[PDB]
Design a protein around this ligand. Structure first.
Ligand code: ADP
Ligand code: MG
Ligand code: MG
Ligand code: MG
Ligand code: MG
Ligand code: MG
Lengths: 1541, 16
RNA sequence: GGUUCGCUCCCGGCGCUUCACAGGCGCUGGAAAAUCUUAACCGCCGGAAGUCACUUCCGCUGGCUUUGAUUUUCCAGCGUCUGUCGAGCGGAAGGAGGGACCUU
């Protein structure tokens, strides 16, 4: 504070004496014993800054109360340079560890707090007595019996008897109560208790005269006549209260914990009935003692207290009890005001009328009180007056406060001088008079008195001790003085000069009161007599007396490490431990004490217990103390209970329930019961749920080994084996335009090719291919051609033709490729077909025999052409030719032949003035020296495209290609003619795309068969299956009555189940990165929605004992993409995924072509070469013809060339990395993103949903071991799955469902659904703030299931209806539909909010404001002015109501009907146009940049500011709201409004 | 029995 | 059929930044309630003991003061988990089109 803190003479001599030895300072209140305590603390601060372990010490300041502890904390903090520690129970030190105490100890130089907290701190070995320097105990006179001060003093006895901290007690009174006889013995007892010597005034000259500033008051007495007569209304009210008591005793409320007498020999009424009985007894006391008007205020107090209790009642019966009490109080109030008005009818002067009714219906005691105030104050300035009024009862304070308010308002002489206020101790009562939340306030009543706002204070004995008040000039005592200490402290409160002390008594009580006062005076003087007469001794060194005084109590126990359990703390410890044990909502866990009878004492014990009492402890089955424990024989039942509790605590510590520090243990974890079983498969892949998976975003991609389907494996034909050839049909869907004439003509030629396999292919759906000329419908024949390879040379011809196709025709060949027949992956061939015996097509043996290799395009000079024969006119149609003189050597097809045309051609628009003959001489005369067959042969030729990836849909557009393309007429003798049929070449052009599509089509067929076999789905459409043509994904972005949802309809009815199409499985397998015309991204949304719903229902059914928090905690891991990735890897599916975008010439491998077998062998067999073979080392290899054809093993040069990379990358520090870049095709490695695998699993789930309903997809989840089975039943049906119990349903009986639901009929009609089990509805409507939440759950758990169900149903509806919308817009629509704001809008639109069972001011006001705004808006969703706040509770209530509607009927169809009848206008409007979120809309604006902010709350209205741009000028708008989200939304809406302008 | 009888308003603050 | 543009646009995925929606959790403050419990003092009524309602002891019960603990609820701020998804930016690849053309 300031340096002006200079002690008095008495303070300095007191601290000087105190440094020498322990003692107690006895000075009147206001003498600054706090100041001398501060000086003592300062004098002992030599070691405060030093650490404890090195020898540093701290000081203790104990206070009897938390409030006084806080006051002393502020005092010591302001008067010292130390940092003070304020430790009380309410601070939360109940579970602080050793470190959490040590840091506080080392950071604080002096410690303050309540006695119990420091007692626990010392006894739990957080500190030791030797670690303390000086101990301060204010109001030490409370240290009697089993007070915590005396326990702390016994801690000195048990601790080391030397090297002990100093102790001082601060007090202004020593005698507690009426022990005013033989005060010397009590003073000696206080001395030995605190092992010190009391010090007080010794020099009458200096100490007394300096203390004189704390003046003694002038003691005055005011008398009133005794009242013998009681009014008639008094007897009427008494009779009514008596009959109400009779009714209450007859009333049968629910069973309550058994309450019994203090010595437990008699039973007592339950606490709740005891409370109303206590309140009515107190009201009767006020009524009898203080008059009718006082009773008229006390009845208001009873009204508000009973209203609060009814508002917080936990049961219908308790509500009925409090309602009966409330109406009886209302009747009493009516009678009281009636009785007042009978006299107020006398005259019209309303102020004088109120004064005279107060005068006439008051008791003479309060009458005298009012006259005394009137004569004492008499229009004095309010700044001068500060007075306290003391009354006994708590409610008397409030009653006198109200009556004095009314009297002041009725007295013009007293109207402005007095500003009354009332204060009650820890047993607080409601200060309001009207209703709940009369006004929010920040200053306490004592602080209002301190600041001068209030000048008259009415208080109980709470203000008597410790609390700092100004020196009051007047003190009044209303009820007679009961204790000596109360009198002394009340007279001490009147501290200022010439202060007035007034006490009230009856006329017949004057002599007894004066006798008691004179006895108090005699005792007060005897205190000084003892102090001035006692002989000087150092520190009361009679240690034998200390031991004899402390030995009466039971000897405490000390365990290992030095912790100590005092016997008087045993009951508290036992009850604290019994609080921890689990139990039902009603079952009492407190120990059931039982006093043993006379015949039991001498049976359990000997005959010694004939007189002394013995008590036994009986404990419920939930706790460990199953064996009964009998107390030691003690002379009183209180000590017997203490001993029994001490022995029980000792037994519990022996059992290990109490820890080393005698505090019960705690729970560890709850959700691990599921992490033990559901997430087992994580471990084998090097992951676990307990570890930090998201460290640096670990491994978002993984490497997988691709595997060809069962049909493509080991399908290579051999000699003599039966073989199957499937003809491939290409049917062009485009028109026969000039641009497309050759394409259309040559695609439908019967010279189709076929694929050779030893295995039998299943039927395959017609599939699309997109060429430049249009789209193709490629289909594979369902019936193969039976062929037998009778000779080995036939097989060799097939193999050489197969290699020649990919090598020369399609130019897929790379130098390091090897043709092989021993590799079994994709071991199959494609052969050409030709018409044989009619429809019996046969292998084109003539073609393969001639075309073992495509002949080289080579030149021929003029003379060589003359030596060669002329080119036959009929040998060119439909044949492939190439320009051997031009730079481009690409092949090109003959589309038209000419004999009328001639190298001496007719001149054209660009060939003007020249024939084509002379044109070739002009252009390339270096090659074309002359033309030898100038006469009669000509051809028209079309180029063929180099494109192989025919999956791109948009490449086939005709708008640009509508423009004419010039012909290319060519002289025949100058171009080499390939005898290969051009129509077969045009079909071979599409071959790689068809092959790659058939690959994954067979994979999808295998998956279809697997998932059909698991479900036992072998019905009619799965053996004679004929697949629909595979459709385009049009949403891929490349170009009254309720209709039942089809998914649920096929879930319930078998007739609507459709076969799981092969194309759908192919789509579910093909990732979006594959660049195809389809993917899984649409199936993923439905799969994810179903997975969410199924996981929610499964967890809520199996684990009903859990809350929504733990259920969500488990579900977030169960449906996580990591879990789905591991789950799908468990199914060995990721080896069949299509993610590669199929670049043939750079990343593909022909089916008949493999790499050198040494590479494959060392890749597979070497862990160092598992994935780390060099890319460019393998891609730089080159092998000879026969080396690549049959040799297999590469040359040593190339072998070492790639083995050097193998060694340098695998057998080095690069181990664990992947070097398979562009050499993925060698062993079939591929890198697939984790989210792709997770979405594959979700898409498979979605396909099975869409095709087979919900139960079959739940069985699929069981197959994927996502839903782990159980021992009783593996897993039940998803529908009719058993979920419910105490947490999803109200446990109340049918007699109170109508008590809680006042008008359930008009919610039943409004919602459109009729409940047969109202218990679900009751919990759905129950907000968590409702009082019954503590016993019968709330809507919070049911809202989880409701959200899952509503989300899945909405997603399924928008999925099945809006078939052309991509997943992004689909989830935007879903988010707009299931937003909390729109859920609240629908809730208010149906007026469901009226039925919410909630009690909360700031929730109800928000609900009312929002519903008023929505009514003003006319139920139109703004997708607002002055920052309207959305009551988030409404959406949760609607979700829980949906869940209740589902659980009542256990049918998703009825639930969907209800949801649709609620959402119909919302669904229509949002399907017409999706309302993107306002923040999203502002951010996505291409011209405006939101740039928001994260400012402060500056009170309730937390502020957010936005920074956007509008027509090139910057603007700054401000958002306000209750929370950050609402303020940001309002700012975004304002920015949108400005942007619109 | 209708009301409290109103005491003599003149009284003295008696010293202890 | 092909080349080319510093040309226009588009799809998907990777890397960085960031937002929205749904289900949550943790930490820190503010507010409210329920239950249990500790200690001390005084009084009413009853019983007992020394001199036997004088003093004391025991019990009932009421009043005041009071300690510690558990649980529930609401609000705000800061982090964070899961699912759906958008936006901005480096960059690669693919496609469409509009120019420059290139064959015959
Ligand atoms: N020597 C002194 N120097 C400074 N202030 C003093 C001195 N003596 C008394 N005071 C003031 O008088 C007040 C005494 O009140 P308090 O200490 O609460 O009285 P008590 O301790 O007797 O209840 C303190 O607030 C203190 O500031
Ligand atoms: Mg003080
Ligand atoms: Mg997706
Ligand atoms: Mg997904
Ligand atoms: Mg919730
Ligand atoms: Mg919700």
């Amino acid at each position: 504070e300031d340096v002006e803190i200079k002690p008095r003479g008495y303070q300095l001599r007191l601290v000087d004496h105190l440094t020498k030895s322990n003692g107690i300072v006895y000075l009147p209140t206001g003498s600054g014993k706090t100041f001398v305590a501060i000086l003592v603390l300062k004098r002992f601060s030599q070691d405060f800054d030093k650490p404890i372990e090195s020898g540093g010490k701290r000081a203790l300041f104990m206070c009897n109360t938390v409030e006084l502890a806080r006051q002393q904390a502020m005092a010591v903090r302001r008067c010292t340079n130390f940092k003070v520690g304020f430790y009380v129970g309410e601070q939360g030190v109940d579970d602080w560890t050793r470190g959490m105490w040590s840091d506080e100890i080392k950071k604080n130089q002096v410690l303050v707090g309540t006695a119990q907290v420091f007692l626990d701190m010392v006894t739990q070995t957080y500190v030791a007595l030797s670690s303390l320097s000086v101990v301060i105990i204010d109001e030490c006179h409370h240290g009697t019996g089993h007070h915590p001060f005396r326990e702390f003093m016994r801690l000195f006895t048990i601790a080391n008897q030397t090297k002990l901290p100093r102790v001082v007690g601060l007090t202004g009174v020593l005698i507690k109560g009426n022990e005013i006889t033989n005060v010397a013995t009590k003073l000696k007892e206080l001395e030995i208790t605190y092992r010190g010597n009391i010090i007080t005034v010794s020099d009458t000259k200096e100490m007394e005269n300096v203390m004189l500033y704390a003046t003694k008051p002038t003691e005055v007495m005011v008398s009133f006549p005794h009242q013998e007569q009681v009014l008639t209304v008094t007897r009427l009210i008494s009779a009514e209260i008596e009959k109400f008591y009779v009714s209450l005793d007859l009333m049968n409320i629910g069973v309550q914990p058994i309450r019994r007498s203090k010595s437990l020999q008699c039973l007592r009424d339950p606490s709740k009935k005891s409370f109303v009985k206590q309140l009515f007894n107190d009201f009767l006391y006020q009524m009898k003692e203080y008059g009718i008007y006082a009773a008229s205020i006390a009845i208001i107090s009873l009204i508000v207290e009973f209203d609060i209790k009814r508002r917080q009642a936990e049961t219908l019966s308790v509500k009925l009890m409090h309602r009966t009490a409330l109406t009886l109080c209302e009747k009493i109030r009516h009678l009281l005001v009636q009785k007042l008005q009978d006299m107020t009818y006398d005259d019209d002067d309303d102020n004088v009328n109120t004064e005279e009714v107060i005068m006439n219906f008051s008791t003479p005691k309060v009458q005298r009180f009012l006259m005394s105030l009137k004569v004492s104050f008499a229009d004095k300035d309010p700044k001068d007056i500060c007075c306290l009024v003391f009354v006994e009862r708590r409610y008397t304070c409030k009653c006198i406060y109200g009556l004095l308010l009314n009297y002041i308002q009725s007295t013009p002489e007293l109207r402005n001088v007095l500003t009354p206020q009332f204060m009650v101790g820890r047993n607080n009562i409601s200060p309001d008079f009207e209703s709940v939340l009369e006004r929010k306030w920040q200053k306490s009543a004592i602080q209002q008195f301190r600041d001068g706002n209030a000048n008259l204070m009415i208080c109980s004995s709470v203000l008597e001790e410790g609390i700092d008040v100004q020196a009051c000039n007047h003190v009044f005592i209303l009820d007679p003085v009961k204790t000596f200490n109360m009198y002394v402290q009340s007279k001490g409160r009147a501290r200022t000069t010439e202060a007035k002390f007034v006490l009230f008594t009856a006329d017949k009580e004057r002599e007894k009161t004066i006798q008691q006062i004179y006895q108090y005076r005699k005792a007060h003087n005897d205190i000084a007599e003892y102090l001035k007469d006692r002989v000087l001794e150092k520190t009361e060194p009679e240690l034998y007396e200390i031991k004899g005084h402390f030995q009466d109590d039971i000897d405490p126990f000390t365990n290992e490490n030095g912790a100590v359990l005092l016997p008087n703390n045993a009951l508290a410890i036992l009850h604290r431990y019994c609080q921890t044990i689990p139990t039902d909502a009603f079952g009492f866990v407190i120990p059931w004490f039982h006093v043993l009878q006379e015949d039991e004492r001498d049976r359990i014990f000997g005959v010694s217990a004939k007189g002394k009492h013995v008590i036994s402890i009986n404990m419920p089955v939930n706790c460990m103390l199953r064996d009964t424990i009998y107390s030691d024989p003690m002379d009183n039942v209180k000590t017997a209970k203490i001993s029994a509790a001490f022995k029980a605590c000792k037994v519990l510590y022996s059992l290990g329930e109490l820890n080393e520090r005698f505090v019960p243990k705690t729970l560890k974890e709850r959700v691990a019961s599921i992490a033990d079983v559901h997430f087992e498969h994580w471990n084998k892949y090097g992951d676990s749920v307990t570890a930090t998976v998201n460290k640096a975003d670990k491994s978002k991609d993984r490497t997988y080994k691709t595997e060809c389907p069962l049909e493509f494996y080991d399908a290579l034909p051999r000699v003599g084996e039966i073989c199957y050839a499937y003809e491939i049909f290409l049917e062009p869907q485009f028109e026969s335009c000039e641009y497309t004439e050759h394409m259309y003509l040559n695609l439908q030629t019967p010279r189709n090719y076929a694929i050779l396999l030893r295995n039998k292919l299943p039927r395959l759906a017609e599939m699309p291919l997109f060429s430049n000329q249009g789209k193709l419908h490629v289909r594979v024949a369902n019936a193969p051609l039976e062929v037998i390879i009778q000779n080995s040379e036939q097989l060799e011809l097939l193999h050489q033709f197969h290699g020649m196709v990919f090598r020369d025709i399609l130019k897929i060949w790379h130098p390091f490729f090897v043709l092989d027949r021993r590799s079994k992956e994709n071991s199959y061939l494609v052969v050409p077909l030709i018409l044989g015996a009619g429809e019996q097509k046969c292998f084109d043996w003539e073609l393969m025999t001639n075309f073992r290799r495509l002949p080289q395009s080579h030149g021929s000079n003029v003379q060589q052409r003359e030596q060669q024969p002329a080119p036959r006119p009929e040998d060119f149609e439909g044949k492939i030719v190439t320009q051997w003189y031009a730079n481009y050597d690409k092949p090109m097809l003959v589309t038209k032949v000419h004999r009328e045309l001639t190298p001496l051609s007719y001149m054209e628009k660009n060939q003007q003035d020249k024939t084509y003959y002379e044109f070739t001489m002009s252009k390339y005369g270096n090659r074309i020296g002359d033309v030898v067959h100038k006469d009669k042969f000509m051809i028209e030729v079309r180029d063929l495209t180099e494109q192989l990836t025919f999956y791109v849909h948009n490449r086939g557009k005709f708008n640009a290609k509508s423009k004419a393309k010039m012909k290319v007429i060519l002289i025949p003798e100058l171009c080499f003619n390939f005898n290969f049929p051009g129509d077969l070449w045009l079909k071979l052009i599409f071959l790689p795309s068809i092959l790659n599509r058939m690959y994954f089509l067979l994979h999808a067929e295998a998956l279809r068969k697997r998932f059909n076999t698991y479900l036992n789905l072998h019905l009619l459409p799965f053996n004679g299956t004929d697949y629909m043509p595979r459709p385009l994904e049009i949403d891929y972005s490349l170009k009254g009555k309720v209709k039942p949802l089809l998914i649920l309809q096929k879930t319930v009815s078998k007739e609507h189940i459709t076969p799981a199409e092969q194309g759908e499985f192919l789509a579910a397998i093909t990732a979006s990165s594959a660049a195809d015309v389809f993917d899984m991204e649409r199936l993923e949304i439905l799969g994810n929605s179903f997975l969410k719903l199924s996981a929610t229902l499964y967890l809520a059914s199996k684990y009903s004992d859990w809350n929504e928090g733990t259920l969500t905690e488990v579900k977030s891991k169960l449906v996580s993409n990591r879990n789905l990735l591991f789950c799908l890897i468990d199914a060995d599916i990721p080896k069949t995924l299509n993610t590669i975008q199929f670049t043939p010439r750079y990343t593909w491998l022909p089916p008949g072509i493999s790499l050198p077998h040494n590479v494959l062998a060392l890749w597979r067999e070497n862990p160092e070469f598992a994935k780390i073979i060099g890319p460019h080392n393998l891609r730089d290899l080159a092998l000879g013809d026969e080396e690549s054809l049959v040799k297999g093993n590469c040359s040593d040069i190339n072998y070492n060339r790639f083995v050097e990379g193998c060694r340098a990358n695998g057998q080095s520090f690069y181990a664990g990395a992947d070097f398979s870049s562009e050499v993925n095709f060698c062993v079939g490695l591929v890198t697939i993103p984790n989210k792709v695998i997770a979405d594959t699993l979700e898409a498979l789930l979605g396909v099975i949903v869409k095709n087979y309903g919900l139960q079959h997809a739940f069985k699929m989840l069981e197959y994927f071991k996502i839903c782990r089975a159980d021992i009783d039943k593996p897993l039940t049906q998803l529908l009719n799955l058993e979920l419910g119990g105490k947490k999803m349903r109200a446990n109340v009986n049918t007699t109170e469902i109508d008590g809680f639901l006042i008008n359930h009929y008009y919610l039943e009609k409004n919602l459109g659904y009729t409940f047969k089990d109202r218990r679900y509805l009751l919990q759905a409507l129950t907000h968590p703030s409702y009082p019954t939440n503590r016993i019968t759950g709330s809507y919070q758990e049911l809202e989880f299931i409701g959200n899952a169900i509503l989300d899945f149903l909405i997603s399924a509806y928008i999925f099945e209806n809006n078939t052309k919308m991509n997943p992004g817009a689909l989830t935007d629509l879903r988010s707009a539909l299931v937003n909390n704001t729109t859920l609240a809008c629908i809730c208010v639109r149906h007026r469901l909010h009226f039925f919410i069972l909630a009690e909360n001011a700031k929730l109800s006001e928000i609900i009312s404001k929002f519903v008023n705004f929505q009514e003003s808006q006319g139920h139109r969703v703004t997708n607002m002015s002055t920052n309207v706040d959305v009551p988030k509770a409404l959406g949760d209530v609607l979700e829980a109501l949906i869940a209740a509607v589902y659980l009542d009927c256990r049918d998703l169809q009825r639930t969907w009907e209800v949801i649709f009848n609620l959402f119909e206008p919302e669904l229509q409007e949002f399907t017409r146009k999706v309302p993107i979120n306002h923040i999203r809309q502002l951010v996505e604006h291409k011209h405006a940049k939101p740039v928001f902010s994260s400012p402060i709350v500056e009170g309730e209205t937390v502020m957010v500011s936005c920074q956007f741009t509008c027509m090139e000028k910057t603007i700054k708008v401000y958002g306000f709201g209750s929370n950050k989200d609402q303020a940001k939304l309002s700012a975004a809406k304002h920015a949108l409004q400005q942007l619109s302008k | 029995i209708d009301r409290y009888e109103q005491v003599s308003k003149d009284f003295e603050f008696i010293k202890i």
